[PDB]
Amino acid sequence: AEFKAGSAKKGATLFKTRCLQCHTVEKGGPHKVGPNLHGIFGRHSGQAEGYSYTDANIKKNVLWDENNMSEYLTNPKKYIPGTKMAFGGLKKEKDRNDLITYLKKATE
Numbered sequence: 001a002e003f004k005a006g007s008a009k010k011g012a013t014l015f016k017t018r019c020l021q022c023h024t025v026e027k028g029g030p031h032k033v034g035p036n037l038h039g040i041f042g043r044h045s046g047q048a049e050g051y052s053y054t055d056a057n058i059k060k061n062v063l064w065d066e067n068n069m070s071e072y073l074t075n076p077k078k079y080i081p082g083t084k085m086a087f088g089g090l091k092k093e094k095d096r097n098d099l100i101t102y103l104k105k106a107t108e
């Protein structure tokens with residue numbers, strides 16, 4: 001449909017350079033300014049254990065899948081108005097496909 005599986009090798013590099021400053025993916029990995037993302041897919045928003053989210057991220061109550069993750073990552077503040085972060089989004093569709101292909105596996 002919208003998301004198409006791409007390169008997880010490229011996705012791992014995009015995670016280091018675009019997400020890893022604020023997030024970790026390992027099971028039991030620490031929160032940074034943003035939550036640890038282990039188990040994020042197939043879970044509703046605002047539910048990383050031990051992380052205090054904004055009301056906006058909780059109230060969005062989105063069930064994370066690859067298509068809404070790609071829409072969100074384009075511009076988080078446009079998808080969840082009120083979310084607070086020094087991140088504008090991953091604008092290229094190729095980048096989002098590669099990152100999400102990696103993220104689906106890295107957060108399992």
Ligand code: HEC
Nearest residue numbers: 018019022033034045046047053054057083084085086087
């Ligand atoms: C690189 C492309 C990424 C990816 C894959 C994600 N982010 Fe972030 N993010 C940050 C903060 C502070 C939050 C919490 C915001 C709030 O409470 O309003 C988030 C939230 C997310 C989510 C939602 C998780 C959920 O449980 O609903 C997801 C899927 C996510 N991020 C993925 C902070 C940042 C950054 C701060 C410098 C950067 C950079 C990123 N995020 C980048 C990414």
